[PDB]
Every structure is written in C-alpha cells, then in structure tokens.
Amino acid sequence: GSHMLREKSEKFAFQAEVNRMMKLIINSLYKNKEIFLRELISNASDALDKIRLISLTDENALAGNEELTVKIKCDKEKNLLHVTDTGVGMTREELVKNLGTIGTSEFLNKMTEAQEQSTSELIGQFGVGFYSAFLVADKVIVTSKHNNDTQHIWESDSNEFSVIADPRGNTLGRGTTITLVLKEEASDYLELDTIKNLVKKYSQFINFPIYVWSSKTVWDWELMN
Ligand SMILES: Nc1ncnc2c1ncn2[C@@H]1O[C@H](C(=O)NCCO)[C@@H](O)[C@H]1O
C-alpha cells in the first residue's frame, strides 16, 4: 500500500478563485483578526443544523456521537487552538471540494469594492469565513468524520493542501475539528480569558451549546452560551 505516498495523490492545489479569495479575506480583516473565531463557530453551527435536519429523516443519523455541541480547547503548550463540532462532518471528497474550490464573481468584485469598508459582514454572509483563520494561523488543519466515510485530515499553509486518511482512526465519532497552529504573534488566543470573551460574544446567538475547556486546579467544559 505504498502507491499513495509514492505518487503523492494526497496533495492538491487550491483553485485560482480560492487563492484570490484568501488574499481578499486576509487583507481586509487585517485589523479585525478576532473575527476568525466567530466564523469557525458559525461554520460549526451550520454543520450542526445539517446533521439535525438529517436526523429528522434518518433514524441512524446520530449513531456515531449522540451529542450536538461545539467544544473549544486551547493547547498553549502545543500552540494550538481546537474548535470541534459534532455536526454532519465531511467526507474525503468534501474536504477536497468544499475547502479547495468554490455568485463567486459578484462576491469577487463586491469584496474588492468593499475594501477600496468593512468586509466582516460580506464574508459572514457568503459563508467563506473559514479562510479568515489564516489571519491568525500559519497552518490550518481540519480533522473530519462523516457518516458516509472514514475519518480524514485536511491540512494547509495556504500554499497548497492535502487530505489523508486519519491514521488515528475514527476518534471524532462524527463531526469536525478545526485545528489552528497559531502564529507567534497570535499567542493571545491561547489565553482562556481571551477565548472565553470571544466565544461568549460570538456564541451568544448560536442555538447549540458551546463549551470551552477551562480550569477552576481542575479542568472541565464550561458552558459559554
Ligand atoms: N465545521 C464544519 N463542518 C462541516 N462542514 C464545514 C465546516 N466548516 C466548513 N465546512 C464546509 O466547507 C465549506 C467552506 O467553509 N468553504 C470555505 C469557503 O468557501 C462550507 O461551505 C462547508 O460546506
């Protein structure tokens, strides 16, 4: 089973439009970097609505994980921020397509014109806030498990991306973990007080419960909304 690594069939290039998109997003929100967390939580919320809808007509929808939540972990020691939801997840095919490709032109011109203003609303409306994670992270990693596939891992430094079967197996049960390798100057997002203030402000209108792994010295999940 060496055919895959010897042929590097796990490596992909982003679609031109996506590269241009990442730049627009990264350039416009340069002064409002914290918005990334809001967009991740928002993407989590959508993923949770989807699985909830599927659970209405599919009796075995929540088999892999009976809960519907969003959990945030700060790993200061490893310089990582994790955002995990137990939503619908993404198959290997969807990781490639949904994250690596994409009113695209209108948004293309609307964004440029919105910079030559605030773009936070547009990005949020068109649902492409995922990329805003690159404002605070050098590498973005997406671990996901969809009912129709095995767990997979997508990773990118924005110059390319790759998808690989997760050698750890099905640890998520169902859902997605957005792991951010924080830039040196973005260490503040590893601070519990900082994350809690952002998560609380950004989860205020999310219908699913959002938790942050915090201390009180004992650790446990803390409800934020
Ligand atoms: N947490 C998440 N769970 C499931 N799907 C997710 C997700 N975060 C992002 N996605 C998928 O990836 C897409 C995405 O954010 N692409 C970035 C902008 O085109 C979303 O439209 C959604 O289909």
From Swiss-Prot:
One of its GO terms (molecular function) is unfolded protein binding. Phosphorylated by CK2. N-glycosylated cotranslationally at Asn-148 by STT3A-containing OST-A complex: this glycosylation is constitutive. In normal conditions, the OST-A complex together with CCDC134 prevent glycosylation at facultative sites during protein folding, thereby preventing hyperglycosylation. Glycans are attached at N43, N148. Changing E39A: Loss of ATPase activity. Keywords: Acetylation, ATP-binding, Calcium, Chaperone, Disulfide bond, Endoplasmic reticulum, Glycoprotein, Hydrolase, Hydroxylation, Nucleotide-binding, Phosphoprotein, Sarcoplasmic reticulum, Signal. It comes from the Eukaryota. The keyword Ion transport does not apply. GO terms for cellular component: endoplasmic reticulum; melanosome; perinuclear region of cytoplasm; sarcoplasmic reticulum lumen. Its main location: endoplasmic reticulum. ATP binds at N43, D85, N98, F130. Detected in heart muscle (at protein level). One of its GO terms (biological process) is protein folding. It is found in: Endoplasmic reticulum lumen; Sarcoplasmic reticulum lumen; Melanosome. The modification Phosphoserine is found at S105. ATP-dependent chaperone involved in the processing of proteins in the endoplasmic reticulum, regulating their transport. Together with MESD, acts as a modulator of the Wnt pathway by promoting the folding of LRP6, a coreceptor of the canonical Wnt pathway. When associated with CNPY3, required for proper folding of Toll-like receptors. Promotes folding and trafficking of TLR4 to the cell surface. Homodimer; disulfide-linked. Component of an EIF2 complex at least composed of CELF1/CUGBP1, CALR, CALR3, EIF2S1, EIF2S2, HSP90B1 and HSPA5. Part of a large chaperone multiprotein complex comprising DNAJB11, HSP90B1, HSPA5, HYOU, PDIA2, PDIA4, PDIA6, PPIB, SDF2L1, UGGT1 and very small amounts of ERP29, but not, or at very low levels, CALR nor CANX. Interacts with AIMP1; regulates its retention in the endoplasmic reticulum. Hyperglycosylated form interacts with OS9; promoting its degradation by the endoplasmic reticulum associated degradation (ERAD). Interacts with CNPY3. Belongs to the heat shock protein 90 family. The SRT pseudosubstrate motif associates with STT3A during translation in normal conditions, preventing glycosylation of facultative sites until HSP90B1 folding is completed. This is Endoplasmin. It comes from Canis lupus familiaris. The gene is HSP90B1. The chain holds residues 69 to 285 of 804 of the full protein.
